[PDB]
Structure 1
Amino acid sequence: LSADQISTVQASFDKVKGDPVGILYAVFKADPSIMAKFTQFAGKDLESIKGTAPFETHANRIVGFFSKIIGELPNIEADVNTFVASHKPRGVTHDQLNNFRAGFVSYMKAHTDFAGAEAAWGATLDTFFGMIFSKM
């Protein structure tokens, strides 16, 4: 992960960072078992909660932290540590983490011309999920 790849990803992300709700929708849709961990959304229709105030609040927190991480590449260890501390006790699995990744990438492909940033994103996400999976 070097500066050329980091700048590519950060340019790519800048295009979509204003759509937290859409990104979170894509993740929940890829794996409903992620959605079922949120007491506020469990048992409701994703298509119906997507436009509500609670969904936006959550989406802003979650994608907001992801945004922190993308902004500081590659110096991400401390933030991954914080992530693991809050999420390890919620029992998040590797499967769910990989579905988060899949949902995100699906979002990016459906909303930008992704072909040009695809390798850089690969490097970034392999690094990020690489660190998480070494810790939980």
Structure 2
Amino acid sequence: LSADQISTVQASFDKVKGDPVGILYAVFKADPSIMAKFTQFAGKDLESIKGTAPFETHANRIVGFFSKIIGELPNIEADVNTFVASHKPRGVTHDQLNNFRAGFVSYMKAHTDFAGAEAAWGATLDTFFGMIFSKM
């Protein structure tokens, strides 16, 4: 993960970072078992909560932290440590993590011309999830 790839990803993310709700929607739609871990959304129709205030509040938190991580590549270890600390006790599985990745990438492909940033995003996400999976 070098500066050329980091700059490509950060340019790519800048286009979409203003649509937190859309990104979270994509992730929940890829794997409903992620959605079911939230007391505030469990048992509701995703299409119905997508536009409510609680969804936006959450979306802003999660994508806000992801935005931190993208902004500081590649010095992400301390933040991944924090993530593992808050999430390992909620029983997040590798399957769910991989579906989050799949949902995010699906979002990016449906909303930008992804083809030019694909390999850079690959390197970034392989590095990120590579670190998470070594800790939980």
Gaps of 5+ in 1: none
1:129 aligns with 2:129: yes
**CA displacement at 1:31 relative to structure 2:** 0.1
Superposed CA RMSD in Å reads 0.1
- What's the TM-score, normalizing by structure 2? 1.00
Gaps of 5+ in 2: none
**CA displacement at 1:67 relative to structure 2:** 0.1
- What's the TM-score, normalizing by structure 1? 1.00
**CA displacement at 1:27 relative to structure 2:** 0.0
Q: Which runs of 4+ in 1 moved over 3 A?
A: none
- Deviations along 1:37-67, whole A, 9 cap, x unmatched? 0000000000000000000000000000000
Counterpart of 2:92 in structure 1 is 92
**CA displacement at 1:96 relative to structure 2:** 0.1
**CA displacement at 1:73 relative to structure 2:** 0.1
**CA displacement at 1:97 relative to structure 2:** 0.1
Give distance in 2, aligned partners of 1:69 and 1:22: 19
Matched residue count: 136
Give distance in 1, aligned partners of 2:19 and 2:130: 26
Matched residues, percent identical?
100
Give distance in 1, aligned partners of 2:33 and 2:58: 16
